[PDB]
């Protein structure tokens, strides 16, 4: 019975809690689950092409602001003129932007160079930097097939080429392909096959930003199991300067001086960065390094404003509210919020009232407030995909990065608060018992405002195990080209003479695990860091040393052929049994299922090697009924070790007795039948 | 307690029961909930307005 | 949904009878124990008594001191819980709550002040 | 004997700051089923108390995750993770195993803390 219906009735109490525990995590998961950025890429002003050199800006305080660029065949003539109103001129004589946005690798996608030329170069800084914010995550870029991963681009239309009315003379058909925001979603699903939702958003200076919010929904109500968030504002033609002009909103140096009482416009800059976002369930289930954790992103509108142009008080803060209340988190839980920061003398001070509003009117400690546009520049559309990566990099590397310009505190904000410090040193911040949290805060011209919560990633990834093994794994690497073949051989010569003491096991992991298999291979198994930079430093130039290198376009299924007699040495089995376990166990498999039919143990006759083999009258394995079975003893055990190693044949070939390693092997018939 | 042996395990059980349901419904109202179309605003070819 | 609005409020002497009436409405009134709570002006609660469900049936428990004063019923096809209060005193001057359940008091209504004052 | 349930009394709670409630209990109130029989109750000045958290770790719908519950077989912890200009009232800890319920305690006085 049950205690007079007490088990019973407390046994379905048991069971109505556990099960809303379990759908009440549900939930907790629908609407806050923490999604992980699994890898960050970006291509910012300046030198700056991985988040790793981006540091390299932010720490030192470098400003990207540098001048107009050249390579794009911009007039810069008609684009500076004494008159401020002249139409066709510009205001800023500068601005961060991209040296390397003009080219682009056409062959290594499935881009033809007309569909290339053609292409936005918005667009073809996409496609690169989808492929290296995969390969950063370790997930080979063409694994993803066929597979839910949403793509989240944010971008402005803008104008790269010609008009599409005249068409052109060798790009005509795939203008529309280039100047099209909704292709810069779907190009990378397609290159990449990527069968996750595609959305293009376009939020002016929020785009990035606001994508990641829509991808965070992804990942929490489950749409894609992996998001690909980010935007970008690459700048083809000066056009875009010319007319931020025409309202005398450009700083004339074109530097975004935030928060500073010398900020005469809020400049502008091009730029892109990229994230790969999971549910930190399935990034860490699936062992997806988890660099920081996204927790909660907001959206929302200025409303009516004073004009589509002019940011809102009320607004702002009930954004940097909201994604606090989405997230769990709150005004005292950031420790350093990264907002807007434009540059304009006019958004600068609402936007700090709205950050003194949200955070600075409860404070214990005072608020770090940051701007990557001091370093970089107002990236647009880039903006908030920028400002993420920023806060992630200080969190990765404990310390607050420095907000250039930022020296003249504005007059026209009360700082008198003390609640929100602003960033004119590096301030240290070190993982401690609170969680390090970070906002990003990205306000559009179009009104539409977001700031998104940045907590650490949480440390739980400590705990590995160390040890010590023999086995020399290939240090595998792939290019689309000779040329980048010899260059990923030299890029990573210099990753491993610049970042010294990576573990050789922890690289061949990495480089196999994390790189596509790409149609131009080289692949070497090192011995040490000084016989591998030396095979690096001969794969560089093309000199095949102690590696292995080949074209193999449309090739991906090995057959195992079987040869016969002629290996009468027989002094190679004793080695690989010595050093690999499985040839130390298959090896003995086979020998006890020859021992029931013929007595000899393969075992101590392999020790016996072609030296001691030739003493009692015999030769290097001449006796048919001896050879025969350790040749075959060693045979099978070959083949499951290319097995054992992941190599499957897709044939079986079998001159003379790999016949019976064919019976063995593919299955045909067992251990005992095949040594019988 | 008094009657029989449940009359205050079977309110925590009527509370936890309830809870479950207004928390399912929950999740049925943040993935499932039907969304109306209050209104429909279209400017289409032909002289449609 | 589950509302529990009470009524019955009013200013009496020591030593007469008062009226308080629990209004049922959004859930199935016979699952459920009714009980009653009181709480004294500005500081702690203290507790009345309840009636268990007639599907229970069992009986009506009250509070030690309003043995022999207060009694409790209840009605399904009207669905009305019933305090009634005979040969009420000084104490007596306080705010009554109807409580959803004999010892999950899950609910609570909004509370009427019953004043015994001379 | 009666089980004698005592949380301090006092708790000055500033918002955005996470506090934590206890309790004593007597006697043991993890039951046989493994459960807690402890309720936490939230009486707001001028309005009737709320149901927060029953079977010592259950929360109860309608109010928001922030009030979090857990405890061991006597020593019990109501986690408040946050505090707002809302959440300032009163907090009964009724032990919810020997009927009759008279005694709901003194209650706690939660503050803004200042």
């Known amino acids: 019975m049950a205690s007079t219906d007490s088990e019973k009735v407390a046994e379905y109490l048991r069971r109505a809690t556990l099960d809303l525990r379990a759908a009440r995590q549900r939930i907790r998961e629908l609407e806050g689950e923490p999604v992980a950025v699994v890898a960050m890429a970006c291509r910012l002003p300046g030198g700056v092409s991985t988040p790793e050199e981006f540091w390299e800006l932010l720490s030192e305080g470098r400003d990207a602001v540098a001048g107009l660029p050249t390579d794009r065949g911009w007039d810069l003539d008609s684009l500076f003129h004494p008159d401020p109103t002249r139409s066709g001129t510009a205001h800023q004589r500068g601005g961060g932007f991209l040296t390397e946005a003009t080219a682009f690798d056409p062959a290594f996608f499935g881009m033809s160079p007309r569909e290339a030329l053609a292409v936005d170069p918005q667009q073809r800084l996409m496609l690169e930097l989808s492929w290296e914010v995969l390969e950063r995550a370790g997930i080979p870029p063409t694994s993803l097939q066929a597979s839910p991963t949403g793509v989240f681009v944010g971008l402005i239309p803008q104008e790269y080429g010609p008009r599409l009315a005249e068409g052109g003379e060798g790009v005509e058909g795939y203008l529309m392909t280039g100047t099209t925001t909704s292709v810069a979603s779907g190009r990378i699903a397609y290159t990449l096959g990527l069968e996750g939702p595609a959305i293009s958003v376009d939020t002016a200076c929020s785009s990035s930003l606001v994508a990641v919010h829509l991808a965070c929904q992804s990942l929490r109500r489950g749409e894609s199991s992996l998001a690909m968030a980010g935007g970008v504002t690459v700048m083809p033609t000066p056009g875009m300067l010319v007319d931020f002009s025409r309202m005398n909103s450009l700083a004339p140096d074109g530097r975004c001086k935030a928060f500073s009482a010398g900020a005469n416009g809020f400049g502008m800059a091009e730029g892109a960065g990229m994230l790969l976002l999971e549910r930190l369930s399935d990034a860490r289930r699936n062992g997806h390094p988890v660099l920081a954790v996204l927790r909660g992103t907001a959206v929302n509108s200025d409303g009516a404003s004073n004009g589509l142009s002019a940011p809102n008080g009320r607004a702002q803060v009930r954004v940097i509210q909201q994604a606090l209340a989405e997230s769990g988190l709150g005004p005292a839980d950031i420790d350093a919020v990264e907002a807007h920061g434009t540059g304009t003398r006019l958004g600068d001070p609402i936007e700090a009232r709205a950050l003194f509003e949200a955070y600075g009117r409860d404070r214990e400690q005072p608020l770090h407030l940051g701007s990557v546009k001091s370093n970089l520049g107002h990236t647009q559309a880039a903006a908030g995909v920028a400002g993420v990566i920023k806060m992630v990099l200080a969190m990765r590397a404990g310390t607050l990065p420095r907000t250039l310009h930022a020296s003249e505190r504005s007059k026209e904000i009360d700082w008198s608060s003390g609640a929100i410090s602003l960033l004119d040193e590096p301030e240290p911040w070190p993982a401690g018992a609170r969680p390090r949290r970070a906002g990003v805060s990205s306000f559009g011209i179009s009104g539409t405002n977001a700031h998104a919560i940045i907590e650490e990633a949480p440390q739980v990834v400590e705990g590995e195990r160390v040890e010590a093994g023999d086995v020399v794994a290939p240090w595998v690497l792939s290019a689309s080209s000779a040329e980048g073949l010899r260059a990923q051989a030299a890029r990573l010569a210099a990753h491993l003479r610049e970042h010294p003491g990576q573990d050789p096991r922890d690289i061949a992991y990495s480089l196999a695990t994390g790189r596509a298999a790409l149609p131009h291979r080289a692949a070497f198994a090192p011995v040490d860091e000084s016989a591998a930079l030396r095979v690096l430093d001969g794969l560089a130039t093309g000199n095949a040393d102690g590696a292995a290198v080949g074209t193999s376009r449309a090739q991906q299924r090995a057959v195992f052929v079987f040869p016969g007699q002629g290996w009468q040495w027989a002094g190679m089995a004793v080695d690989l049994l010595d050093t690999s376990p499985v040839f130390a166990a298959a090896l003995r498999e086979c020998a006890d299922a020859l021992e029931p039919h013929l007595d000899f143990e393969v075992i101590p006759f392999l020790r016996a090697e072609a030296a001691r083999r030739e003493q009692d009258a015999a030769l290097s394995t001449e006796r048919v009924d001896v050879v025969q079975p350790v040749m075959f003893a060693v045979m099978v055990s070959l083949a499951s070790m290319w097995r054992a190693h992941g190599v499957e044949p897709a044939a079986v070939i079998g001159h003379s007795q790999g016949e019976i390693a064919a019976a063995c092997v593919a299955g045909a018939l067992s251990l005992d039948d095949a040594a019988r | 307690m008094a009657s029989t042996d449940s009359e205050k395990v079977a309110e925590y059980l009527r509370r936890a029961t309830l809870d479950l349901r207004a928390a399912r419904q929950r999740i049925r109202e943040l993935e499932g909930e039907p969304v109306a179309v209050v209104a429909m605003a279209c400017r289409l070819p032909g002289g449609v307005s | 949904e589950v509302q529990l609005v009470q009524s019955g409020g009013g200013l009496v002497q020591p030593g007469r009878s008062l009226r308080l009436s629990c209004t049922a409405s959004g859930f199935t009134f016979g699952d459920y124990a009714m009980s009653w709570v009181r709480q004294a002006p500005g500081k702690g609660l203290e507790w009345v008594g309840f009636?268990?469900?007639?599907?229970?049936?069992?009986?009506?428990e009250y509070a030690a001191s309003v043995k022999g004063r207060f009694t409790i019923s209840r009605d399904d096809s009207k669905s009305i819980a019933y305090l009634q209060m005979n040969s009420l005193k000084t104490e007596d001057t306080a705010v009554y709550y109807c409580?959803?359940?004999?010892?999950?008091?899950?609910?609570w209504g909004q509370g009427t002040l019953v004043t015994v004052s001379s | 004997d009666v089980v004698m349930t005592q949380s301090p009394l006092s708790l000055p709670v500033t918002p955005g700051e996470p506090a934590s409630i206890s309790c004593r209990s007597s006697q043991s109130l993890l039951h046989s089923n493994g459960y807690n029989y402890l309720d936490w109750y939230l009486q707001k000045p001028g309005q009737s108390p709320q149901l927060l958290i029953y079977?010592?770790?259950n929360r109860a719908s309608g109010v928001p995750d922030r009030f979090s519950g857990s405890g061991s077989g006597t020593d019990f912890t109501l986690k408040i993770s946050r505090v707002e200009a809302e959440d300032v009232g009163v907090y009964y800890c009724?032990?919810?195993?020997?009927?009759?319920?008279?005694?709901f305690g003194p209650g706690t006085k939660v503050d803004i803390k200042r």
């Open positions: 079977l010592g770790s």
């Open positions: 409580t959803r359940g004999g010892t999950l008091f899950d609910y």
């Open positions: 009636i268990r469900s007639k599907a229970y049936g069992g009986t009506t």
């Open positions: 009724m032990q919810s195993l020997q009927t009759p319920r008279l005694t």
